[PDB]
Ligand binder design. Structure first.
Ligand SMILES: NC[C@@H]1O[C@H](O[C@H]2[C@@H](O)[C@H](O[C@@H]3[C@@H](O)[C@H](N)C[C@H](N)[C@@H]3O[C@@H]3O[C@H](CN)[C@@H](O)[C@H](O)[C@H]3N)O[C@@H]2CO)[C@H](N)[C@@H](O)[C@@H]1O
Length: 344
């Protein structure tokens, strides 16, 4: 397994630089022979894969790490203890807090974690966004909001961090979400994204009023290709309320609850670190290969200096690798890694 390359996109000036990782590790619960039958059982097994997962994370050595598919017990016994030793602290929330289940099932619920190096950042606030609660609260007048959106218990997490002056009070919000997966539910994915951005803006308003100005880095497994309403909404500061992906009700007035006519907008002016298909895919399986993971950043606060390019495709060809995971690749997603430059 050859080390991944690095694409330089812009030189360092000559004021704060830091790196961000985004990585869906593939949780044990979903690593089944049914879905990944082309991978031998011994290489699917968590006791085997978790080693490759930790190696990938250690090798990337990112200042900030956003993971998806982190199982609750594994956050507390594997990811946090190990990354504490590398100088990180972390924030984790699982999905399904409100769902009733046994002690044993609770250990295996997955969720999102953000880690940050404490020599560079200090935690100011931490937040969990429950898309099912936000949908329920904004569902008046929409059966679809209640039937299709509220019933999915996906989440995102966000932290407000202090960026230490030595790297140049400067604040930074890092947000990390994992959206619903089903290709037939583009509406849910889009609404979940608008709910998340909307709630992050509410978080940001309450980070400022404590004696628009705060940069955002948004990591996510959006389960959405670059041509989707989700990515258009994130990249262009808004989306039409009649966008095809809303699958009717399109023009529902309930969408405007997230919406700051006909356009649902946000003011974050985001850009994707990997735009212009610098990786041809982020999820790589036999049945599906495509870009569905993203690192977005406030383009008025930050430059992209570089990204970690894709695993060499001739290597996948020579080794006949048509899907992941694989004995040498421990997740069906490739990690994303970017170096950003923050100008206060
Ligand atoms: N062809 C339609 C496309 O599907 C893509 O996603 C693919 C994949 O991510 C997703 O399914 C994947 C596939 O392993 C297989 N279908 C089992 C399982 N559902 C898994 O979904 C899993 O669960 C999480 C739940 N939260 C997902 O967010 C996460 O990406 C994934 N680990 O559905 C697609 C099937 O591969 C993208 N959503 C988008 O490109 C478009 O919708």
């Amino acid at each position: 397994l050859p080390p991944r390359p690095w694409i330089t996109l812009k030189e360092r000036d000559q004021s704060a630089s830091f790196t961000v990782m985004c990585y869906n590790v593939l949780c044990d619960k979903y690593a089944t022979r049914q879905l990944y039958g082309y991978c031998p059982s011994w290489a699917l097994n968590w006791e085997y894969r978790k080693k490759g997962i930790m190696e990938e994370i250690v090798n990337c050595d990112a200042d900030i790490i956003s993971l998806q598919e982190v199982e609750t017990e594994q956050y507390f016994t594997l990811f946090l203890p190990a990354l504490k030793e590398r100088g990180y602290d972390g924030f984790f929330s699982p999905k399904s807090r409100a769902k009733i289940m046994s002690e044993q099932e609770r250990k295996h619920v997955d969720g999102c974690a953000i880690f940050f190096k404490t020599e560079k950042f200090t935690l100011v606030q931490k937040h969990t966004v429950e898309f099912n609660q936000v949908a329920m609260a904004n569902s008046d007048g929409s059966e679809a909001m209640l039937n299709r959106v509220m019933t999915k218990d996906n989440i995102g997490v966000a932290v407000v961090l202090e960026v230490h002056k030595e790297l140049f009070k400067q604040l930074l919000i890092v947000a990390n979400a994992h959206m619903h997966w089903d290709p037939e539910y583009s509406d849910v994915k889009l609404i979940q994204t608008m709910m998340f951005v909307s709630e992050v803006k509410n978080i940001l308003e309450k980070a400022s009023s404590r004696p628009n100005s705060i940069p955002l880095v948004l990591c996510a497994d959006l389960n959405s290709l670059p041509d989707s309403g989700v990515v258009e909404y994130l990249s262009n500061g808004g989306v039409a309320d009649n966008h095809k992906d809303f699958k009717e009700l399109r023009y529902n007035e309930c969408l405007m609850n997230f919406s700051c006519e006909g356009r649902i907008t946000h003011g974050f002016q985001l850009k994707s670190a990997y735009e212009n298909n610098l990786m041809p895919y982020t999820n790589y399986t036999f049945d599906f290969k495509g870009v569905i993971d993203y690192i977005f950043y406030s383009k008025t606060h930050m430059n992209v200096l570089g990204v970690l390019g894709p695993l060499d495709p001739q290597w996948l060809v020579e080794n006949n690798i048509t899907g992941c995971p694989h004995p040498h690749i421990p997740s069906d997603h490739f990690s994303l890694l970017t170096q950003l430059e923050l100008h206060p």
